[model samples]
Target chain A: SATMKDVARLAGVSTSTVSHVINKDRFVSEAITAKVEAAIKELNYAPSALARSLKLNQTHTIGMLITASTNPFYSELVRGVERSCFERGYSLVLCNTEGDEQRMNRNLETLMQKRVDGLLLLCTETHQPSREIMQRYPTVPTVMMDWAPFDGDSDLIQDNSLLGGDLATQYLIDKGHTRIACITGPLDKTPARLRLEGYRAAMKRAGLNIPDGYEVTGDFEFNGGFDAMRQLLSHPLRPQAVFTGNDAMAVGVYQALYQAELQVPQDIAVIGYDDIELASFMTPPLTTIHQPKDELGELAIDVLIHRITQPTLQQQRLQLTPILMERGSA
Target chain B: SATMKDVARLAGVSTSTVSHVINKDRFVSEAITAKVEAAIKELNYAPSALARSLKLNQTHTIGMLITASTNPFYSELVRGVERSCFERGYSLVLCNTEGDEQRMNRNLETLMQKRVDGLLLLCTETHQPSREIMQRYPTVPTVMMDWAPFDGDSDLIQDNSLLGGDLATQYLIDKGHTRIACITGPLDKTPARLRLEGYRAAMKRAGLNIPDGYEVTGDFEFNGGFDAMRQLLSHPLRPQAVFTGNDAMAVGVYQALYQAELQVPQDIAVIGYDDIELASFMTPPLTTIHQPKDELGELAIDVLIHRITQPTLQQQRLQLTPILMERGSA
Candidate 1:
């Protein structure tokens, strides 16, 4: 409850001297400095960054709108962004849309009104309704994280999922999995569509026959993968190999396999995309494609800051290659 | 980029008229209203809530500082808080501390300066260094989430961990588990200590002596629980049943059990706390104490809001009773 005046009066120094002591703007005698430090420590003075940010016309803050904070994948992205923000001496205001259009609109409005210097949007897949709302707010320095072809004016940093998906499918094919089943995430998103395309391309290249209940649609979540895998297992002749859209779904496949009393890479080989942290810790460490999640966040911040500092800078895009992480599951 | 004056000029009206149209202060002529709305739409104008908040002296915003967004348990709390915030039409500014003292301090300062109407602190466990900094900012209304015995001026809402812990232990005892092991979270935390006390009391009432290496210390995380379970498995006499401080660590226990080829209940009955969403989906649904996580968040918000709206309201404490959610694991 103590104010600068309280510290200044207690220290027997002018208000400016208190400010100087706090900001270290000017040199002061050791006696006065010691007195001020004592007053500050006694009062437990905590300076307000908000007032300083207002004077500087920059909040030194960036806004991030993540899809689902409950998902560890997105939380990891947030960690990367937070690390970047911390090293750069900036604060991040995070909003979770939780895949609701109305909520996204409200969150976008709040972030915009906060006048954040920049924004990091997680349009991981497509079909994000907020895309239109975002395009309308062209005043903010915005950058999109993950792969999405929304024809937006913002910069993009994401993993090249097409190649990653192709690589995953090819790996399974090389393991003599001609009757391999594939689980695709919601195909409405650009990444999902592209990944599925790559899977089809690999299947075509191998001249494998398309069987019933082979290609399933998943929502790119644990339960989604679990339900899809359950459906696959119900088939009269279950496939010998499976490729999930993401590692979350692959975990589902693992659960399904366990329920059916099947062993990994023996009764049914499996591979997944997006090697999240938990991927390596699974019962049988999941073999997955390593997407540059941290890099995506770091680059998103870098480009966003660039745009903030230089409003006239041209838009940019960075597509990172995915690496195949060979593990026990495959 | 368009201002109210721009829309006013385009609509052939005064700036005040434009503001009224935007705020819906008073009804205007139909023709004029149509023109103002058209001009606003054409300009792609986005109103600033900051300016409105300054006039109303109410930001209608609450700040939440979560320790770790990566943890689903905490994220679920965030979800509950967000739902409550939405229902009340209050905006939330979320900051992730990631369990860093300096970070928590910075976040606290940021939220204070942002002038949030209220705050919800999730520094549930003790040992938080920002406690003093929080005490320095006593002007704002705040409520501490989870069970921590911090001597702060904020109201507290927590689960009755003593009863929850006793319930979990008694369930295992009733199942004929004479040899039981306990993996408690950090003993410095109030809830952890209380839960351990309850466990000891229950064991005393049942007249069972816990053998050496029966009680292990865990950090209430997947790896922490996993490592502790591994240590227990290495003991000369393994435990017939296990009780974890929280569900997150119990997940690690399941993994360790699986690694040792020990089946749940059949080999080692397990019980956990805080029935998170994933608990039911586990291979054998986890039997644990259902701490009212969502209700805690909602009540925290309700109290903070009440204090913010009526600053003179007396400080209060609410201890919610826990329900035992019985499933197959126990």
Candidate 2:
């Protein structure tokens, strides 16, 4: 709570000298600097970042609007982002939208008011209201991860889910399994739809029959995958192999299989996407499509910072490829 | 980037009128208010929180310094804190200390410079350097979760890890298991030390011998748990039951058991603490101690906000009780 004037009076120097010592905008004598610093420490005077940001026109902070930090995938992604920000001398302000449009808008408004240097959109979905709010602040550099903006000029970074889906299904089929079922994420999202399309494409290319009740939808959660697997088990003809949309769902699939007294890779082979850390720790060590989660996060920051520093650069759309991770499950 | 002057010019009003409209401080004619609102929307002007915070001396933002957000327990706890903050009309500025003393000090300096209304310390361990920086800002309200400050005046919120550990050990004893071992977290931390003491107390009460090489240390992570479990497996006389310090390590224990072709509750009974979401999704569903993670987070914010609004309130220490969550693991 001590003011610059108080430090100046105590150090026997002008307030401008204290300001120069604090900001380092002008050269000052070493003795004067030391006296000012001593007075600051003695008075416990903490300079204000708000005032500095207002004057410098930069807060050195980035705002991240994510769906849910509790999700394993997002948690890991956030870790990478946080590390990158720390290395660059910037701080991250994280807000979980929880897939709610109104909350996303409110978070955006708060970030804007705080004058964040850039924005990172890691939300699963974007609605018109939130998009409108984003458009209102076109000057703020933004990078969208895993999804494209509904309508905007933001940079896009996404994984090739279609290829990942095809790889998973084909890996199961190569083992001479005809009955292959798919547990797709909510079809409303682009990633889910593309993955499902890849499944169909692979099945057709393999000259395999598309049996009824072989495709089910999940909400990209453990319970949804559990219920979906239960439905698949009740069918007249059970599939020999299954491809889950994500690692979380794959965990549920394992649980359902265990409850039914079935073993993975013996009764039903399973593969998952997103290869989250839990995937490897699963009972059978699930075979999954490895998306570079950490790199995705790190690159998102790098690109957003580039956009922030170089405002006139052209818009970008970058895609990362996913690889198949072979383990005991399949 | 439009300023108040731009808005005022567009609205055909003075800059003071524009400020009043934005702050809702002084009453104005309805017609003038409508004009100012229209101009704001037309120009897409965002008010600066920096200026407002300087004038009001309250940022309405809380700074949370956590060890790591990627950890499931911390992630879920953060969810609770964020939801409570949203409901209270506040924003959260999160900084991950990653348990590095230098990083912790730098984060503390940044948070102090930002002038956050309050501080939440969810760090696992605190060093003297970081503690000194905190002491420099005695006026700031801080609430430490899961650990008491070594030397400071701050509110403390911690779970009764001792009771939880005793309950876990007793549960195994009641199941007629005598050769029980414990995998404790890093002994340098208070929670880890307390939990280990609880384990020893229970073993002493039951007149059970904790054989040599039975008590091992883990870093509260999966690989650490896995390595510890493997070490126990290689012992001359293996333990019939095991108590992992936390759920993450419990997961490693499961993996090690599976690799050894051992089954849960059939070969060796297992129990964990902190009952994260992944606990239930484990193949046999882990039974562990349930800490009210969400409640802890919500209450931390409530307590910090109270301290911020009423600075004269006495410092308090609150403890939450842990309960047993019985499942297939034990």
Candidate 3:
């Protein structure tokens, strides 16, 4: 609870002298430094970065609003961002929006009030009111990851899900699978829509017939995939192979397959997107489209910092390519 | 970017009037309030919580030092803590120590400098120097989760891992599995050590001798479990069942089994700990000891906040009980 004044008084020195010694902004004599250090120890004076940041007009902190931290993909991305922040002497304040618009708006307000140096928007859903609230604070630099902003003001860094989807479906087609079914994520999101479009394009390019129940909708979760796969199994003509939206859902698909007494690759071939860590550990070692999660996080931080330091820079729209990770499943 | 003075000047009112109108701290005339609101909008003034928190002597921010956020258990725990913080109007500053002592010490210092209202210590490893650094900040209330502090100054909340281990081993014994192998986490940590102890106790109680190479060591990670299971498979006397330390490692064990063309429950019964979300989605649906991760996080935050608000309260040590989840694996 001790303050700078208390340290100064105990050291018999001016407050500015104590500040200089603590901050190393100016050189001080060894005798004076020793006295100040002794007084600081005696008083247990911890310098308050909150007050310092207020005066310096920078908090050395970044506010990240994510949809859910428990998701494997998000957790890995967060790890990468945190590592970059640590190496750069910055701290990260995290808030989980839980995909709720109201909570996202509330968290954004709180971040603005705290005056974070920059903002990282990872929310899966963006609402009109939230966008307006963000527009009010034009001075704060922001970088959007995974989700692209409707307007062109903010920087965006997302993986090319369309390409990833095309590669996954094309690979399945090349493997001589004609009746291919796809479990698409919620169509409301851009990634899901684009990935599904890519799937349709690949199937068309292969001159495959468009079946009525070939495209099933999922919420990009385990239950969604499981339920979707179950529906597919009940179809009049079960698909030879399935392309899942994400790895988490692929696990669910595998479970559903297991319940039906079906073996992966032997009974049905399946491919997944967002090659999370558990993808490799799947029973058949899932074949997935690998999104550069770590690189996405690192690039996001670097670009946000760059924008924060150089406010005059133009907005950047960056895209990362995804790769096909061939495993036993497909 | 706009200051209160600019808003006050534009509104033709004093700074206190602006503050009162913004904070709703005092009753102001409708006319005055309208004027202040108009000026705030015109100047695009965002009230700074930094200055307000400094004056109020509370940041409404909690610092959480975790070992690794990418781990499913830690991510779920963080989700629970973040939800609690959000509901209680607090922001969380997250720092990942990555089980490095130096990083832990550095993060502790950063948190102290930021003047967090409270601290949540989820670091798996605690070193002497980090302990000393923490001791220096006795004024900052902290709740240690999972890992009990050597000194009794901080509040502690941990799951009864010893009992969890005992229950897991007892269940296996009750299933009539006499030749059971164990994969333990790093012995330096209490949870790992106690879980192994419980396995040993159960084996001894059943009068079953553990073969020389039945017990293997793991680092509580996927690779560690995979390598440990490989070692177990090479043993001259192959065990009928294997108990993995945690769910992530359990997945690795499943992978190893798959590589050796073995099936779960029939070839080798596998039980794991910390039934993470993906546990049930595994091929055989892992049967493991379930730690109360969400409750641990919620209680830790509540205790930390209580300590912050009521510093005169006595130090509390709380423990949660784990449950056995029966699934297809065992």
Candidate 4:
């Protein structure tokens, strides 16, 4: 808790010299720097966080806003961000919002008051009205992850849903199955919408046609996928293969197929998007489009930090791709 | 940003009176408290964290020392702890040590320097070298979750491997599988060794002699499960059922079984401990022992916070029992 004055007196130099050495912001003689350093070490001095907070104009702490920490995906993303923060010698404060808009707003206000350096945000793509909360923090730099619909200018990382959708359809088409069906999350999401577009494009590319009832919508929950699968399968011409928008829904699809006593690939094959870690070991190991989870996390951090320090940088879009892991299900 | 002095001056009262009024300390007269409260509301004054930190000898911040944040089970566990912290108006600092002892030690040192009020720790259960560090602080409380080891006067919450082990083994035995093979995690863990004890008990109770080469040892990883499954199957009398210590390895067992084109339940029933969310969605859906995850999280927090405020309270152990979630996998 020593100040520049104490270091100056010990080093027999002016307080300004001590400040210059500690701040390292301006030119100072090497001898003066060494003297200040030795005095600091000799006294076992630690910097006064209170006093430094006033001088640096930098808090060196970041705020991470997550919709729900209960979801395994966001937690892993946080791990990547935390590792990078440690390397940069920065501190991270986290808030789990439980997908409540009111709570998200409250957390935003709290972090802002605490003087966090920047923000890394992961919110449900389905949120609409409260998504504008990101716009209020005009001065703060933020990098949005997972789901995206940033009203204000921001960087984004999301699974390539179009590629994801196409992979599902194409995997089935290649397996000598012309009849395919789709179960998607809410169509409001750009990623989900794009994925459906991809599915349609692939089906058209393969010259396959299906009735309007072949596609069904759900809330991306397991139950949603379950009911949607039943709706799709309760058809005269049942699909030979099925593709879902998200992993959670894929889980529902698995249960639906299991209850129906249908075998994967032989009777019906299933493919899912955002192939999270659990995909590798599902009963009939799921075929999925894998997005680079860590890369997405790291990219968001870099953009956010840059925006915080250099606010004048132009806003741009960063769309990451998805790779399909062909497992047993497909 | 305003301090108690500003509110006191506005209210025409001494700072001590203002503190008493704000805290609702019994010594303050009701009339004076009302006056101070009015002044506080009018001035829109919130307590300064720095000033409060000085007075209460608390920073109002905590550290969550954990391993991989990406783990589904761990993520859900932290969500529970975070919800508790958020509701209490406390802030969290996250440190990911990835189960490394050296990194955990460094995190402890850093959080100490940062002046955290308490710690929510989840470390390797093989041993507890962190007890010495906690002993030095004496006041900074720690609540170890997931794999808390019995250490000196430390509040801990861990699953009774004794019970978890017994439940898993008994379930397999009830399924008419007398020659059940095992894929055990490192026996270095008390839980693992005790689990084997439970397995032996079940075998003895059923009058079934577990033959040699019926067991495989792995590090509780997917690779271990894969290798163990392969090794177990190589034996002439291939066991009908397999019990694994953790869910991660159970997934590996499925992968190995998938490669061999062996159907689940009918061909070989697979049961695992730590029934994670993903387990229920696996192809046949996993039937495993479910630990009280959120309860474990809540209990650890309650115990640590209590011990922190009341150091004179004797240390205690709270072990949770595992429940069986019957699914198609077993």
Give lDDT tens digits, candidate 4, residues A66-179: 765333456557777887887676778888776576777777766665566787777665553244334333347777754656566566665667877887788778878888
Q: What are the lDDT figures for the candidates, one per model? A: 0.78, 0.85, 0.85, 0.73
Please tell me which model should have the higher TM-score, number 1 or number 2: 2
| Preferred candidate (lDDT higher): 1 or 3 | 3
Clashing pairs in 1: none
TM-score of chain A, cand. 3: 0.94
Candidate 2 residue lDDT tens string, A220-276: 888878889999999899999999998878988998998999999899999999988
Clashing residue pairs for model 2 = none
Q: Any residue pairs clashing in model 3, and if so which?
A: none
Single-chain TM-score of chain A, each candidate: 0.84, 0.93, 0.94, 0.80
lDDT score for residue B179 of model 4: 77
Question: DockQ for each of the predicted structures, in order?
Answer: 0.35, 0.64, 0.68, 0.34
Docking category of candidate 4: acceptable
Residue-level lDDT tens digits of model 1 in B1-330: 677888999999998888887778887788888999999789977665555554564667788876663345775777678778877877777777765667777777777766677878777546453566666664678788455445566777767788888888998899889999899888876777778878888999999997878888888778888999999999899789999999888888888887898999899999999998667666677899998666667888888888877898888678888788999898
Task: State the lDDT at A257 in candidate 1.
Answer: 79
Better of 1 and 4 by DockQ: 1
Q: Which one wins on DockQ? A: 3
Tens-digit per-residue lDDT, A206-325, candidate 1: 898768778899887887788999999987778888889988788777877777888898899899987887676676778999886766678788888888878898878777888999
